[PDB]
Amino acid sequence: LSGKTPLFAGSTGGLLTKAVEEEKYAITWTSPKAQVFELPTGGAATMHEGENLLYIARKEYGIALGGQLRKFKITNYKIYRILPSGETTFIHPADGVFPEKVNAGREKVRFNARSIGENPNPSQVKFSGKATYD
Amino acid sequence: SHTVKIYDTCIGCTQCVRACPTDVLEMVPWDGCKAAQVASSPRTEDCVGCKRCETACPTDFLSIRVYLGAETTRSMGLAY
Amino acid sequence: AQAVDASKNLPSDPRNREVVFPAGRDPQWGNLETPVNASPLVKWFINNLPAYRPGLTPFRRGLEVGMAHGYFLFGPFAKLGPLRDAANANLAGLLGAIGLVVLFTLALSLYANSNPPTALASVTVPNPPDAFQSKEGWNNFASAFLIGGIGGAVVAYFLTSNLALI
Amino acid sequence: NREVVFPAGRDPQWGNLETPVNASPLVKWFINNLPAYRPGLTPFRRGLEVGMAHGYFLFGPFAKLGPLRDAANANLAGLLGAIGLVVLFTLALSLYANSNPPTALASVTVPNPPDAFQSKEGWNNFASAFLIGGIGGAVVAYFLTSNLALIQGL
Amino acid sequence: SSISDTQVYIALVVALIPGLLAWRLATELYK
Amino acid sequence: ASFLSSIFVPVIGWVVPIATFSFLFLYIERE
Ligand code: CLA
Ligand code: CLA
Ligand code: CLA
Ligand code: CLA
Ligand SMILES: CC1=C(/C=C/C(C)=C/C=C/C(C)=C/C=C/C=C(C)/C=C/C=C(C)/C=C/C2=C(C)CCCC2(C)C)C(C)(C)CCC1
Ligand SMILES: CC1=C(/C=C/C(C)=C/C=C/C(C)=C/C=C/C=C(C)/C=C/C=C(C)/C=C/C2=C(C)CCCC2(C)C)C(C)(C)CCC1
Ligand SMILES: CC1=C(/C=C/C(C)=C\C=C/C(C)=C\C=C/C=C(C)/C=C/C=C(C)/C=C/C2=C(C)CCCC2(C)C)C(C)(C)CCC1
Ligand SMILES: CC1=C(/C=C/C(C)=C\C=C\C(C)=C\C=C\C=C(C)\C=C\C=C(C)\C=C\C2=C(C)CCCC2(C)C)C(C)(C)CCC1
Ligand SMILES: CC1=C(/C=C/C(C)=C\C=C\C(C)=C\C=C\C=C(C)\C=C\C=C(C)\C=C\C2=C(C)CCCC2(C)C)C(C)(C)CCC1
Ligand code: SF4
Ligand code: SF4
């Protein structure tokens, strides 16, 4: 991960020991202009001209931030998952296309060909380990 | 963790993917003739259960349903 | 004309000097370096307290801690406890103070016998404290707390009861 | 009813025999979590807990049954007499320690090895703690017994 | 006016028998 | 016979809670 941290003096709302112990996420993006943007947790910061990087405690802070950057007309936002052993993964746009738009490589996951109304009654499914929504 | 189940009555609004904060959802194509768009729940580990997807679903009743279950650090939204 | 209006927005101006800083050099961390948190006076005091002092054994840390607390906890039971207006008032303080020390030692052993999670690092003390990150270190700390705790309370008992002769 | 007694482990060749007194859940918990066998303790802390138990123990027989029983200095004799045993008990440990001990041993009630008692340093640190805790336990029992009328007097 | 002492001591000794079986009953259920 | 209450009451108020909470706390934290 390569990028400049946005300039802000610091804030109590931010990374805690859970970042070092369990996992921390990091959001990266590129800007045309240096502007002011509200951080995900308190305060304001001055994003640099290009290749900005920010470490966030949760994934929700990044996508929430990504929506704000879209209002500044920035859609090249990328999120990573950093584990304590240094492992990094391309999490949010696993495929390069955004989730809203379609791609052929994707496949159905947890699809029910029936309707919710046609779910089995739970009395038919008890003492078996099965749930109705399967 | 939680389980997001998506049923046959999807029509391809894509609104569920937008309202989601955690990117648990993704729009995939259908081999069928219905449309080139179906909602999916590929990464359910990040599902927190905020039911924003169920607020953006314009069906007679929910095509996409969120069933709560076992909890984790991620599903509880704990930054500590 | 401008007594101070011209002076603002200058680095030489005394107002513009900043006392608060990001934790370490990474602002993304939680804490903030402040005079209370990161001053040399507070850093020296906290880092050289028995829990954080360099090059001490876990037993010697608890003895310093227990001797303090044992000598402290005698006071509330004696003057403000029951039978405070009786001849044996100071005696009740010695027993009650040692009672908390036992419960305090019991709590240490329980937190010890439960595999403790970690000992954390902060701005006031950058290094980790000591070998309190293990089941063995906390146990030795508990045995030391009980010895100092009973000793400190006896010391407070002897001085206060024998204060008139002193 | 089921069979209670069984061979030690899977080997019947070995001497040990699993029995209720030997290999019950209650006894295995108590013995294995005693200070000599408790997990996650240092050799020093094991001896202190042991000596503190024995020091507080040995005060009684001297005072209540020794000479000067029916005297004013009866309880004092129990404290001094008890400390004499802890010193001799500490000496016995140091001699058994300074002489190369053979080893500790495992049994059914304590399957894993006991602790780092397989060296001179393990027993010597045990001995130093025995004298400290042993003198402490006897001193405690002296003040309680001598001032028991006061504590009840409260 | 009150039960004798030896009677009261007996009732406590008898009380161990329900307590013992109660402990054995409970540990059986947890399995 | 009234000396039983002097021994039993503090046992119920202090000893039994300490033994139960100490056992339960360590038990719920095992792995
Ligand atoms: C009528 C009351 C009653 C009964 C019969 C049971 C029965 C049971 N409970 Mg239960 N429970 C109850 C009330 C009751 N519960 C209440 C009010 C709560 C609070 C919400 C719970 C909370 C609870 C939990 C959280 C769990 C159970 C579980 C269980 C099962 C295992 C045995 C057990 O309780 O652990 C025995 C507990 C012990 C601490 C062991 C010691 C035995 C008793 C308590 C003490 C007796 C010793 C005595 C005082 C000393 C004198 C004798 C001495 C001389 C030897 C069993 C089906 C467990 C389970 O999963 O079920 C399958 C479990 O995890 N219970
Ligand atoms: C249900 C059981 C129970 C029992 C038997 C007691 C008994 C007692 N409590 Mg108590 N308490 C209880 C529950 C109980 N508490 C609970 C649940 C609470 C929470 C609300 C409290 C809150 C409470 C307060 C806030 C205070 C007491 C105090 C006292 C003592 C006052 C006696 C007196 O008249 O003046 C004093 C008469 C004396 C003869 C002097 C007593 C000296 C102490 C008790 C000697 C203790 C030595 C001890 C065993 C050492 C422990 C180490 C050992 C474990 C190895 C008495 C021993 C008072 C006290 O100060 O006690 C010192 C007091 O201030 N209790
Ligand atoms: C309600 C809590 C309380 C009570 C009742 C006491 C009571 C007592 N403390 Mg004490 N103390 C306390 C809290 C308390 N302290 C705290 C919080 C600390 C740590 C900051 C200390 C540290 C301390 C030390 C280091 C010493 C005492 C001593 C004494 C005894 C003085 C002798 C006497 O009887 O004169 C008559 C007493 C009174 C009429 C009332 C109390 C007056 C004392 C002097 C108050 C001192 C504490 C101070 C004001 C706390 C503020 C700290 C805060 C700014 C951080 C007395 C029994 C001394 C001792 O053992 O006696 C030989 C001693 O050497 N205390
Ligand atoms: C002959 C050996 C002997 C003698 C003389 C004593 C004497 C004493 N013990 Mg003691 N004790 C013994 C063996 C002995 N014990 C054994 C073998 C153990 C371990 C099982 C203990 C564990 C023990 C504890 C845990 C405590 C004492 C305490 C006391 C004192 C009670 C106060 C008093 O004087 O009341 C008057 C006493 C008497 C008139 C006669 C002695 C009566 C005691 C209560 C008998 C207890 C021992 C028992 C009968 C031995 C068989 C145990 C076996 C089933 C394992 C007293 C000095 C208490 C103490 O320090 O006092 C404050 C205390 O807290 N003892
Ligand atoms: C000013 C200031 C302050 C204050 C301080 C204080 C107030 C102090 C404390 C105090 C204390 C808290 C003290 C204590 C002390 C104690 C002691 C002095 C102890 C003693 C001990 C002893 C001596 C013991 C011994 C023994 C043993 C151990 C065992 C056996 C027995 C015997 C007894 C021998 C502070 C820091 C806050 C802040 C800053 C400033
Ligand atoms: C029922 C039962 C039983 C019984 C039991 C018994 C009877 C017990 C014993 C008892 C004992 C045997 C006890 C002892 C204890 C002791 C103590 C209580 C101690 C004390 C200590 C101290 C406190 C000290 C401290 C110190 C020090 C260390 C140093 C300085 C000084 C001082 C003092 C501070 C048995 C197990 C057999 C079996 C099973 C069942
Ligand atoms: C201390 C002492 C004494 C006494 C002792 C005795 C003899 C006692 C007995 C008594 C006892 C110690 C008792 C206990 C109790 C018992 C019981 C009887 C319990 C149990 C019950 C039950 C019935 C339970 C229930 C349950 C179940 C079943 C299940 C679940 C859980 C529950 C808990 C709910 C004497 C004076 C000698 C001497 C001095 C010291
Ligand atoms: C310095 C410091 C701090 C702070 C602190 C404070 C500011 C406070 C504390 C507080 C506390 C922590 C308190 C405590 C208290 C307690 C009490 C209040 C108790 C009492 C008790 C009693 C009353 C009892 C008695 C008894 C016994 C023991 C036994 C026998 C019986 C009787 C009941 C007698 C911290 C943590 C941040 C950190 C470290 C350092
Ligand atoms: C528990 C147990 C057991 C058992 C045991 C028994 C059952 C018994 C023993 C026994 C014994 C082991 C005994 C001892 C005794 C001793 C004596 C009897 C001594 C005495 C001495 C004296 C009397 C002296 C004194 C003195 C001194 C010390 C110094 C100075 C001088 C004089 C002379 C003063 C066993 C081992 C298996 C294991 C572990 C646990
Ligand atoms: S009906 Fe619901 S799940 Fe289907 S496309 Fe519309 S918002 Fe998405
Ligand atoms: S409940 Fe929340 S995380 Fe789950 S699908 Fe709906 S919006 Fe997404």
Elucidated via? cryo-EM
Amino acid (one-letter) located at C83: L
Alpha-carbon distance A36 to C11, whole Å? Answer: 22
Please tell me the distance from the alpha carbon of residue B71 to that of residue B80, in angstroms, as a whole number.
15
Whether the CB of D149 sits within 6 Å of ligand 4: no
What are C57's two structure tokens? 């054994």
How would you class D5 by CB atoms within 10 Å of its CB: exposed for 0-12, middle for 13-18, buried for 19 or more?
Answer: exposed
CB burial string E7-28: b at 16+ within 10 A, e below: eeeeeeeeeeeeeeeeeeeeee
Helices (H), chain B: 15-19
DSSP B37: -
d(CA D88, CA C165): 39
- For A23-35, the DSSP string reads -EEEEEE--SS--
Q: Decide: helix, strand or coil at residue C33.
A: strand
Name the H helices within chain C: 35-38, 40-47, 58-72, 74-79, 89-113, 135-161
- Closest Cα to residue B8, out of A17, A118, C110? A118
Q: For residues A4-27, b (16+ Cβ closer than 10 Å) or e, as one string?
A: ebbebebbeebbbeebeeebbbbb
Pairing mode, strands B3-6 and A52-56: unpaired
Decide if C153 contacts C73 (C-beta within 8 A): yes
CA angle E10, E14, E16 (to 5 degrees): 125
Minimal CA separation from C101 to chain F, in Å: 15
Chains in touch with D (≥3 Cβ pairs < 8 A):
C
CB C100 within 8 A of CB C73: yes
* CB pair distance less than 8 Å for A114 and B78: no
Distance B31 CA to ligand 10 centre (A): 17
Give the HSE-up count for residue C150: Cα atoms under 13 Å, Cβ half-sphere.
14
Strand partners, A79: A27
Closest CA to D40 of C143, C137, F30, C133: C137
| E6–F contact, CB cutoff 8 A | no
Nearest to D141 by CA among D75, D50, D48: D75
* Binary contact (C113, F26; C-beta < 8 A): yes
Q: What is the 3-state secondary structure (H, E, C) of chain E?
A: CCCCHHHHHHHHHHHHHHHHHHHHHHHHHHC
Cβ pair C108, C74 in contact under 8 A: no
Q: How far apart are CA B52 and CA B17, in angstroms?
A: 10
Helices (H), A1-133: 17-21, 59-71
Neighbours of B49 (CB within 10 A): 18
Q: Is B33 annotated as a binding residue?
A: no
Comparing CA positions, the residue from C148, C149, C121, C145 lying closest to residue C133 is C121
CB atoms within 10 A of CB C153: 29
Instruction: Copy the structure tokens of residue A75.
Output: 């859609």
Q: Between the CA of residue D22 and those of A70, D6, D29, D105, what are the distances in Å?
A: 72, 11, 11, 15
* Contact indicator for D52, D137 with CB cutoff of 8 Å: yes
| Cβ count within 10 A of residue A42 | 11
Q: Which amino acid, residue C36?
A: V
What six digits make up the tokens of C16? 């513009």
Q: Which residues make Cβ contacts (< 8 Å) with residue C39, sequence separation at least 6?
A: none
Sign, CA torsion D108/D110/D112/D118: negative
Per-residue DSSP letter, C127: S
| Identity of the amino acid at E21 | L
Instruction: Please answer whether residues C52 and A41 qualify as being in contact, where contact means their C-beta atoms are separated by less than 8 angstroms.
Output: no
Residue indicated by tokens 């951080």: A39
Give me the phi and psi of E15, to 5 degrees please. Answer: -70, -15
Closest-CA distance of chain D to residue C136, Å: 5
SS3 for F6-29, per residue?
A: HHHHHHHHHHHHHHHHHHHHHHHC
| Dist CA A69 CA A31 (whole Å) | 9
- As a dihedral over the C-alpha atoms of residue D138, residue D144, residue D146, residue D152, rounded to 10 degrees, the angle is -170
Integer distance in angstroms from the first to the last C-alpha of chain D? 56
CA distances (Å), origin A125, targets A120, A131, B60, C106: 8, 7, 26, 49
Q: How many Cβ atoms sit within 10 Å of the Cβ of residue B68?
A: 12
Task: Say if CB A94 and CB B28 are below 8 A apart.
Answer: no
E16 half-sphere exposure, CB direction, 13 A CA radius:
4
Query: Starting at the edge strand that comes first in sequence, how are the strands of the sheet with A77-82 ordered?
Result: A52-56, A24-29, A77-82, A88-90
User: Nearest-CA neighbor of A103 among B29, C88, C34?
Assistant: B29
D39 touches C: beta carbon within 8 Å: yes
Task: Confirm or reject contact between D136 and chain C (CB < 8 A).
Answer: yes
As a whole number of angstroms, the distance between CA C55 and CA C130 comes to 8
Q: Where are the extended beta strands (E) located within A1-134? A: 24-29, 36-38, 44-46, 52-56, 77-82, 88-90
Residue to mutate (ligand 1; options E25, E28, E30; most atoms within 8 A of CB):
E30
* Beta bridge partners of residue A28, listed in sequence order: A53, A78
Report whether B19 contacts A126 (CB < 8 A): no
Direct distance between the N- and C-terminal alpha carbons of chain C, in angstroms, rounded to an integer: 69
DSSP D52-113: HHHHHHHHHHHHHHSTTTTSTTHHHHHHHHHHHHHHHHHHHHHHHHHS--------SSS-S-
- Which of C119, C166, C137, C150 is CA-nearest to residue C60? C137
Could you give the C-alpha distances from A22 to A57, A78, A87, B79, in angstroms and in order?
A: 10, 21, 12, 10
The span from the CA of E4 to the CA of D140, in Å, is: 37
